[PDB]
Amino acid sequence: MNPIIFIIILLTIMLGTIIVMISSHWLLVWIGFEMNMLAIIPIMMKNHNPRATEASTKYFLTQSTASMLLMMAVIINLMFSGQWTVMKLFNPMASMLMTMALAMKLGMAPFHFWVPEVTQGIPLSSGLILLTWQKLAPMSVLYQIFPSINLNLILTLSVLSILIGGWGGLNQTQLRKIMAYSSIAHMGWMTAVLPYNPTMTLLNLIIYIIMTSTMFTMFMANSTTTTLSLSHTWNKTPIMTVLILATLLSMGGLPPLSGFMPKWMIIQEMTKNNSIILPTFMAITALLNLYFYMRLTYSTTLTMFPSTNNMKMKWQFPLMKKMTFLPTMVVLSTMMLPLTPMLSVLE
Amino acid sequence: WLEAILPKTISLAQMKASTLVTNQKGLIKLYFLSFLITILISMILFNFHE
Amino acid sequence: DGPEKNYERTMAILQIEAEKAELRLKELEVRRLMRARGDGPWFHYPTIDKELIDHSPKATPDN
Amino acid sequence: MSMVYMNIMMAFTVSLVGLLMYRSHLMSSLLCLEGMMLSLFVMAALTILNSHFTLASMMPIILLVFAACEAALGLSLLVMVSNTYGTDYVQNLNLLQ
Amino acid sequence: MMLYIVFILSVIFVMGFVGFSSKPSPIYGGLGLIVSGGVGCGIVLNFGGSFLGLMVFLIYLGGMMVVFGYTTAMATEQYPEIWLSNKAVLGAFVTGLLMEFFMVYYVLKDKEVEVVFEFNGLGDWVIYDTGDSGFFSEEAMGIAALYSYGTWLVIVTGWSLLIGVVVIMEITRG
Amino acid sequence: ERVAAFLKNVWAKEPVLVASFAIAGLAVILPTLSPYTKYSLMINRATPYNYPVPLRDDGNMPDVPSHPQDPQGPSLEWLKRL
Amino acid sequence: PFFDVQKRLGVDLDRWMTIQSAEQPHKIPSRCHAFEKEWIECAHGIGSIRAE
Amino acid sequence: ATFQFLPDEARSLPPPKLTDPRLAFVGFLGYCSGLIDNAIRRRPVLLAGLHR
Amino acid sequence: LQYGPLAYILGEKATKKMTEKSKLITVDGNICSGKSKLAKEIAEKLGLKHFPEAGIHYVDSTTGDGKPLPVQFSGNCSLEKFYDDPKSNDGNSYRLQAWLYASRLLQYADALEHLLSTGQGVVLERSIYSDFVFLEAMYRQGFIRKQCVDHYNQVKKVTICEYLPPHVVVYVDVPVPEVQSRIQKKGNPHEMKITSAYLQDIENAYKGTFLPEMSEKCEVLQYSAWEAQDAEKVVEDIEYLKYDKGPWLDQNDRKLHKLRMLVQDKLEVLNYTSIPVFLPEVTVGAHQSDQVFQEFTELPGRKYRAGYNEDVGDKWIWLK
Amino acid sequence: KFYIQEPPHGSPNWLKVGLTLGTSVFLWIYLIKQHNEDVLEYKRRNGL
């Protein structure tokens, strides 16, 4: 890709998301999703191989199907209220379709099958956009229509995502599939608290984006896409193993790291609503995620895996990738718990 | 009680569940067919459309 | 530290903590009523703005 | 509701089921995707026309334009898939399992 | 009766959808969609949507569906399999028609049917607007308003179409 | 001078594109310079598509005619002489 | 909107099409103009919980 | 207000002190980011790029 | 500016600097074939940059102070040990070959980076396109295991596909007995232990595989030992080539920008030369890897990124 | 010249150093000026 075209396509991705977040009209929300999808396909295809073509095709079909269901919900809403305003919907059938459409876009279980495959089939930089920026638009709609959302449906989607995301990650050695199942589990926490306190959805979303961006950036810095490739980092960039260790433990929700804060604040909100079984089940199930984060820390940081002779050649050359914002992101990924009350800025 | 809550028994369960979740054919046809089953039982068994 | 300084320092700590506990309990009660009745600034979900309505004479009279 | 809404809603469902029950040709699924859009256009036009909601008259056109541009992207991916395996069968798109 | 033309068209509309949704060869699936598109225009015409109806012919049928058929000739099929020669297509085709017929038979007899949801059967003519004598097409006034009210709609639509050109060239370069 | 010899080259080699750019340039510039552009808005305004609903006379409307042929109200004398 | 840029900048990007009782070309009214107008005015500023 | 970071009414409240303990912690986090920047690029961690 | 998209957007495009003399030329042949001499003459006559054959210490020559590093930092690969004990149990044979391929891969990137950045052509002595002949010869003599060949092809498959082939391939065909006679004349004690069978396998690999393949996409010029001495005639032939084959004709500023973005990043160049394929010859265990790396960081001007080493006289560190 | 090749950071990028110090200076001036105006407006609104 021409560097100027790449920038223009990236801005179109951003503009599609922004349109969704500033629109008060359902048609413009739908247009935002269409624009966003149109511009995201070229960055998935940018390395021109059969796996990239398969990923883009599977992505296109899933997102296109969801956008059709979103439009169907919009028209049903128009039939029963005679208006297009982006807010609660005025028909239960429209609410179910819109909720399922957005769950499909987010990749929540049991509409989750595309996320591991699409992420595996596209470059790390494209996966970073897919699993972070692309969550903003569907979540911003869910933030506005949640009063009309069926509580049983949304909590069922949340519980299944935490279970599927946790179990799916245990069997993975590919770093992009691990991140994909991590994403599915984390969307579950975001939507579980949505009916009770949407502010905690935003808090979990922002913190998730920061840690996920950190992990993808560190994977890109070393061009690692597999567990065994990542296990060579100790014999090249020892510092990077420590950063990876801390970030993974944060993503595991261990105190006193930043990734504890969203799980902690979400448990608080549901208990205030006399919801005890659900937070307890979710916290225990999230130990599945902690297990396969810990496995990565074992092979990356806490043990020294075997190396290769040709690695000595790498010792002589500096790390020249941009690694943009990594020092900032990694510090926020790990050391923000003392500043937790700052979550009220999102209110 | 021992067989129920051993480290070996809990670990095997999750390992078995993980293979159920992850052992997929990778076919567009099967994933979308599961979407159809999901939407039907959402309305027929759980009345999520109400 | 002398026993009077610790003793009266404890009272200052207790006053702050006791006041915070009372405010925490009120907030749970205030939130419960606002959400159930929608008569407060919280849980104020938007409704369509009436300044968007056109009040001029229309092409036909019955409206 | 009116009679027509029964059949128009049914047509959307039929094409949705058709889309979710893949066969072999990827083209056949793109047709079901475009059938869903057709019924959406007809359903929206009928609602907008019947209610005399004048400014919404442009909405079905905007839907048609974006959907067709969206269908163009789908056809581009189909030809790239077909250039790789010689057919557009969806059972070839299983490398990422 | 002619008073039920819209309902009759909507019945054919559904059969066309069963035609290509059972997914025969995409050559015939495309034909089923062309017929549905033409019938879809007919429905829209009878609700006063002259301009919107003709856009279906011009854009949906004369534009998008031509490219669909064009691409099918290149990348999908050149010869078609005998229509209904597959058990699955015929089963789906027969399944849809019978479901459609049972819906139509009961609504006509009762002037109302309950397929999941409640539907009337008196006729579509009953919901129509009664008084009209403006000296213009209201449907045309709304679409023309795109250029005076929808500055925002034009910009984003215009941008997306330009991006479509850029993107498709990137996708197909290889 | 540098631009003058540039135009001569395009005129000799790509006259079709030179005409296109010139015609399109005139389309974007001339409406701002034409003195008749203001009458386009006036004529469009003067065309009465919908009924002119009369006002209720409160006695404080000296500028509102009581009858169509009265001397108050917008005039189209400018349009007749146009 | 999630980010109410329109209100904050005082620019109308899409609010003009949101409801059928808004200003229309040539003052053409919708069939349910008076009904939508009445419901909007009743429900204005009290919130959807109260309005329902 | 709508889509305003600090509405005008917020100016009645006392400003945070420049010696706020939370602000010092934020400053400390910034210092840590500076060191990690040096480390990932194999610069002398403490001395390198004081301007940065 | 450091080269990147911003520099590219501002005009730094390969076609604006590449002329008709911007050619990559590689000289190939058997051992002791006088290719080093012919390569040196072509560069001088044509005004191209000459690249000596990439040996064990080629990477040492491009980093730090340019001087060769001790052997532990090269993995104890020894060309001398290869002749004396080609079947040694320490896996020296394949470890050397895997190391040598990586050195050539680095040199080819250095060559391409030079050509794309300045427009001046380069002359190489063998390359990653012809390195396999030694691998095939080693395998056919039983010096390396079959699994070693599989590892070599795995690495080659995911590296060579990124780079364009030479514009010109110059092959100097010296018959094996003549080479076997010249090796003895050269008076190298270890090299004199080579066998004709090994030399014959090297020759077979060029003619069987290399030359036919490169002909499909390169201009291939062949010479004998006598015809090779006439450098002017060889340079005359090169200047009269047509250039109508190979992928170089499909290149444009866009594609060469992506190629220049790769070859300038040496860690990205070597990314796959150390894939985690645990093969005994090239696998190093953690304790040895750990302490050798620690020793490397202690070498002069190696602890920190170049420009931040006070022990070698770098200044203004507190502003760099 | 110890290095066989000129390092990218052999000499400091003086412009970038000037920008870095300039931005830090500007931000500190803006913050203190902002803080002072917050204090004065805080006291005017509460009549201190």
Ligand SMILES: CCCCCCCCCCCCCCCCCC(=O)OC[C@H](COP(=O)(O)OCCN)OC(=O)CCCCCCCCCCCCCCCCC
């Ligand atoms: C304050 C409120 C917030 C509280 C939450 C806790 C915040 C702390 C987490 C901050 C984020 C992680 C950043 C940690 C900085 C690590 C830098 C460091 O200590 O040195 C790394 C070390 C240096 O390696 P290198 O520079 O490449 O070469 C050495 C030659 N002199 O690299 C090595 O030599 C590798 C050594 C082998 C790996 C050992 C792994 C065990 C030690 C890990 C310690 C960090 C664990 C972080 C978890 C939190 C701890 C409470």
Ligand SMILES: CCCCCCCCCCCCO[C@@H]1O[C@H](CO)[C@@H](O[C@H]2O[C@H](CO)[C@@H](O)[C@H](O)[C@H]2O)[C@H](O)[C@H]1O
């Ligand atoms: C993925 C499958 C997609 C298939 C989409 C099929 C189209 C669906 C059309 C839905 C439109 C009709 O939707 C349905 O209409 C009736 C008519 O008032 C509503 O009314 C019904 O439910 C509520 C319940 O209190 C009341 O209005 C009333 O008791 C009852 O008649 C339903 O609440 C509404 O859900």
Ligand SMILES: CCCCCCCCCCCCO[C@@H]1O[C@H](CO)[C@@H](O[C@H]2O[C@H](CO)[C@@H](O)[C@H](O)[C@H]2O)[C@H](O)[C@H]1O
């Ligand atoms: C009270 C809540 C407790 C929450 C606990 C947190 C969940 C942790 C999930 C771990 C599940 C997977 O853990 C996995 O278990 C199996 C045990 O069969 C191990 O597998 C090992 O044992 C099995 C047989 O026992 C062998 O066939 C296998 O070759 C061997 O590798 C895996 O090495 C381990 O990774």
Ligand SMILES: CCCCCCCCCCCCO[C@@H]1O[C@H](CO)[C@@H](O[C@H]2O[C@H](CO)[C@@H](O)[C@H](O)[C@H]2O)[C@H](O)[C@H]1O
């Ligand atoms: C006057 C305003 C009226 C509104 C006009 C509407 C805007 C239309 C924008 C079209 C922009 C096209 O811009 C056009 O780009 C090409 C780039 O190849 C330039 O042309 C250049 O590239 C071509 C390559 O094909 C070369 O053969 C040519 O020698 C070189 O000059 C033209 O000098 C420029 O006219």
Ligand SMILES: CCCCCCCCCCCCO[C@@H]1O[C@H](CO)[C@@H](O[C@H]2O[C@H](CO)[C@@H](O)[C@H](O)[C@H]2O)[C@H](O)[C@H]1O
């Ligand atoms: C890549 C994006 C390209 C976008 C290109 C946009 C080109 C736009 C060019 C012309 C736009 C405005 O075109 C024209 O400009 C003049 C400028 O006063 C306006 O003004 C003119 O008409 C009005 C109407 O009463 C008069 O009052 C005024 O005296 C007269 O000057 C016109 O009403 C407008 O029709």
Ligand SMILES: CCCCCCCCCCCCO[C@@H]1O[C@H](CO)[C@@H](O[C@H]2O[C@H](CO)[C@@H](O)[C@H](O)[C@H]2O)[C@H](O)[C@H]1O
């Ligand atoms: C990819 C490119 C992205 C670039 C984004 C640039 C943003 C463009 C902003 C367009 C909207 C500008 O702001 C909006 O313009 C239109 C026309 O001027 C105005 O609309 C005007 O025309 C009709 C006439 O009645 C009505 O909509 C309204 O009565 C009137 O105000 C709006 O009052 C104004 O709020």
Ligand SMILES: Nc1nc2c(ncn2[C@@H]2O[C@H](COP(=O)(O)OP(=O)(O)OP(=O)(O)O)[C@@H](O)[C@H]2O)c(=O)[nH]1
């Ligand atoms: N095992 C192995 N040896 C190699 C490789 N490249 C060179 N060598 C050895 O390096 C030694 C010298 O290389 P040559 O250039 O071919 O011989 P030379 O006499 O020095 O050079 P010329 O006579 O000019 O051709 C030879 O013994 C080669 O076998 C290689 O890729 N693998």
Ligand SMILES: [Mg+2]
């Ligand atoms: Mg030699």
